[PDB]
Amino acid sequence: SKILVIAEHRRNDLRPVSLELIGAANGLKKSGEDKVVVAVIGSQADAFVPALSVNGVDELVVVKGSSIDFDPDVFEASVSALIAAHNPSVVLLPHSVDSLGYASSLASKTGYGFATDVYIVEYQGDELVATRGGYNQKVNVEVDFPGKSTVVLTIRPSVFKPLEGAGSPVVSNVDAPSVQSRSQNKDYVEVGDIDITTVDFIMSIGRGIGEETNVEQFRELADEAGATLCCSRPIADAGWLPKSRQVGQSGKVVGSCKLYVAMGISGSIQHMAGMKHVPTIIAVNTDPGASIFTIAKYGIVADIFDIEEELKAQL
Amino acid sequence: MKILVAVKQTAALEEDFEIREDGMDVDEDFMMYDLNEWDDFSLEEAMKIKESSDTDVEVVVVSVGPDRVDESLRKCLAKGADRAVRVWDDAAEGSDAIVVGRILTEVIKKEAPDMVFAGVQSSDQAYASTGISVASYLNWPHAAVVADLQYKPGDNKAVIRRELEGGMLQEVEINCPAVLTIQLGINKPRYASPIEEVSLADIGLSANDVGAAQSMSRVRRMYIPEKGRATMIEGTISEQAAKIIQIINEF
């Protein structure tokens, strides 16, 4: 059998989720003799052969299509042709913004199994069994794929461990199917900064703060504590704090932080992406069912305004 | 000019919910229903286009769901949607994102809109699949995770910005009509807190086209997993705050 992994790159750099999928694939395959095939797609993708010539890769396919970076029409056509060529039992995509632009289009056309944002996967006997979340991550939903010869999964980032070491895949080159894409990529853009929240001590505010006039008391709490003030997405979407202070998947990963104090933040997957590595996490939230409590070291089920005022008094 | 916005009424769970006796879903008694958070933004974006245009723009919201979904659709009309369409038959129970994609497409073929907007994902199941499935069945141009849209009614191209990991955006020029999945923050919905009924027969589908049997995954069970547990600090505000300060210093 073969497992097909689609790598991901952007702005000349390989995204590290690629190596996570290679670990996942190697953990998943049923026998030592099964092969892991990795594809990298892009008009300049030969550049990535060194970075993808790693432990666990049996075959590496460079697909040259019409665009440098991701294009949904090019990726759908290319991945379709790879599945045809390699007959994989399982195809692993990252559950990434790029994959959102085509994975479910690729699955709609076909007789394939499909599930997204998967964080457990195994074979039981010959049966592939995948688990994903339900009801805002309050349950696990365990699924299988009856009678499907090919299953496409998108895989949650930061769950599967990459393998260590070099490898020696058979490298090949193919052209993408000649598809004129219905979109064209234009500039990358960084939107219109004082601090870089690759800092040590963070107090982070979420939607629980209620109204923009409540931001100031937290900025004063962080001031006096010696913390940097960050936020979850709704605060920055509202313009209440700059996008530069946003923690999470489409904000920053707070790589240097040792103490992160999350106030009125539910702990969405996307927020956790930015901060779940922090050694000491304190959550202050009036909802005991909040996901944030599943990663916090310390939990306080209390009103954030009452804690903030007391905290400022005691300091 | 017509913009069609697919909307979902999502379910959130009350505290102390339980799994059904068959183990395939949560007990319905613990569900609270409301419009998906992404759909506030998608609807507001359609309404911004209507407002900017000196020409006429019909904004139609469409949802596939049972009669509870009327509550959410009526609220969409009250906020300025021109028309609201609900599609359902009992045989559609358990239809996954790809099947919902198929049903929405049958409606869109009859409506023949100029753009289709869907949310990036649902707050309940977070498939992040439905809108791009519709694109596939329509064979239309598409882009996911749209944070900005520059579009005039009847143009044959639009410029979008898609939101990437880390904060960067990518400008993309896309052929129109297109399906776009719309991201949080693209705008600020201004109203922050009859319905046309369509059957499967009306859109040329049958029982064998829809439902759990036609879905791309089969649910084996749903269950409440063992998750990480925090050290809960009990006591008064003063001690909870004292606890925090003792933590801050040891650091």
Ligand SMILES: Cc1cc2nc3c(=O)[nH]c(=O)nc-3n(C[C@H](O)[C@H](O)[C@H](O)COP(=O)(O)OP(=O)(O)OC[C@H]3O[C@@H](n4cnc5c(N)ncnc54)[C@H](O)[C@@H]3O)c2cc1C
């Ligand atoms: C592709 C994509 C990218 C995303 N990127 C990011 C990202 O980079 N960063 C990010 O943060 N999110 C991101 N999200 C958005 C994410 O899905 C959530 O919408 C967001 O994280 C929720 O923010 P929140 O926890 O502040 O609000 P909510 O989920 O509304 O939680 C507010 C919390 O405040 C609590 N609360 C209310 N009042 C009080 C009180 N008086 N005292 C104590 N607690 C109180 C509530 O109990 C609740 O738990 C992304 C989503 C998508 C799909």
Ligand SMILES: Nc1ncnc2c1ncn2[C@@H]1O[C@H](COP(=O)(O)O)[C@@H](O)[C@H]1O
């Ligand atoms: N039952 C439904 N009726 C109409 N639109 C839906 C339905 N389910 C999902 N959607 C659309 O898809 C988005 C949610 O994404 P997903 O996570 O893929 O279901 C919603 O915001 C809607 O635009």
